Structure 1
């Protein structure tokens, strides 16, 4: 990780130069932090710095809660990221929320969280074909399944009463991705429980796994039908979003992966 510390130290000496440049003009505390806020170049390095810190934070998170990558999911981590990071900016370039140092984080934490829900599900599909998993693997991923589940949910609860007690604003979209992150933990909720009975039984279960996939296919359809009832609210008010059609498009794909799969089994 010598190159990783190289990127951090060079960037720290870059943010160390900007906060020294701003200090030399305005010698006092409060005008320094004000001048770093308003001037477009000093804000971009801090934008660049914070992306580096979360990059190291994600890898440290990926180190602790994931022992070793199977070298077949990082591209699956990559494409769903630039789906989500394009999703957030498109909503931001629609809603006229403007560049402010209070909501640019919230889209990036939205980009942060959504990746690990993808990293949850790829780890549980590998669990479906894992014949040697210890109790330390099983008992520690359920904590990650639970802990970021509630922290997303309580921040959704922080948001949905902010939108209710103020009016229709940019916080309306925020809880809606939080809502499908809310289903995202309820996705790995059912998948752990159905995994729990497969490991303890030394025999395949035919209708049990079929009903397990049938239940997960059901709520995964209901979760998207609330989310389509989310988006369709926004034609009458504000403006045509021209975004969130990409996971509109996969949403009904998951439904057709559910309705036709149930019809063939029935």
Structure 2
């Protein structure tokens, strides 16, 4: 906790030194904020204070939604997150959208929501093998089920009206990625539905595994269809992705590990 407060104070000391540098140069309100916007190091430190602010909001959101990290998903976020930091960074620069401090702020909103879906997956994965789960865990995770799926429904609705009214822009890849995230909250629901009927009965159910393998087959078919339609569009309009082939190979492998295993079983 000491190193966390040190990191916050060592970032806020730079922001209070950048702001006090501009206010001495341009002694008013309006030419100061304009000067921060055009200057590169002045907007850089204001970016750093923004990321520390969204870091600490994530840590307090993780603390209220999960009681304690198991230190086995703590690594598992770190590789995925890196995965996610780089491909948003590559999608931001390939599209020639130019560095704007309201679409960078949108991209870390996608990454912040993407990290919370992944944390829900690993928590519901150990909900399979947790024989001692309180009612606080059950309510606090279905709250995470609702709050996410409504949020991606809202941003899909915001994006597919943006792709019609405005035209072809970067708002297409936002709503498509949230549509994949909409399938992602869809996956963890059915997995929570089948594992809630598991705990209420003091006997194993063989059809639960059959429904779980069928459900993973389902959405995996939905996932590759979303990625394949995502391929066919941006070759036609704008330019080659050069990204999003990262989770696609995992999406075919998700389809490979589900369809072929069910074919070998059934």
| Shorter-chain TM-score range | over 0.9
The Cα shift of 1:15 comes to 0.3
Q: CA deviation at 1:96?
A: 0.2
Spell out, residue by residue over 1:110-138, the C-alpha distance to the aligned partner (whole angstroms, 9 max, x if none): 11111111101000111100010011111
Q: 1:36-87 deviations in whole A, cap 9, x for unaligned?
A: 0010000110111111111111111111101011111111111110111111
- Residues in 2 aligned to 1:228 and 1:243: alpha-carbon distance in whole angstroms: 13
Tell me the number of residue pairs that the alignment of Structure 1 and Structure 2 aligns: 266
Offset, 1:226: 2.0
In the TM superposition, residue 239 of structure 1 has moved relative to its aligned partner by 1.2
Instruction: Name the CA distance, whole Å, in 2 between partners of 1:48 and 1:22.
Output: 17
Aligned-residue offset at 1:156 = 2.1
TM-score with structure 2 setting the length = 0.97
Cα pair 1:190 1:216 within 8 Å, conserved: no
Determine the structure 1 residue equivalent to 2:49: 49
CA distance in 2, matches of 1:9, 1:70: 28
Which structure 2 residue ranges, 5 or more long, are not aligned?
none
Tell me how far apart the structure 2 counterparts of residues 184 and 55 of structure 1 sit (CA, whole Å).
23
Return the offset for 1:209. 2.4
Secondary structure in 1 matching 2:161: helix
CA apart distance, 1:7: 1.1
- Aligned mates of 2:24, 2:149 — CA distance in 1: 45
CA offset at residue 184 of structure 1?
Answer: 1.1
Equivalent-residue separation in structure 1 for 2:91 and 2:242 (angstroms): 8
What TM-score, normalized to structure 1? 0.97
Cα deviation, residue 217, structure 1: 2.1
Query: Which structure 1 segments of 5+ residues have no match?
Result: none
Give every structure 1 segment of 4 or more consecutive aligned residues whose post-TM-superposition deviation is greater than 3 Å: none
State which drifts further: 73-82 or 213-222. 213-222
Q: How big is the shift at 1:261?
A: 1.2
Which residue is 2:231 aligned to?
Answer: 231
- Give the Å deviation of 1:3: 1.5
Residue 241 of structure 1: how far off its partner (Å): 1.6
Alpha-carbon distance in structure 2 between the residues aligned to 1:120 and 1:224: 22
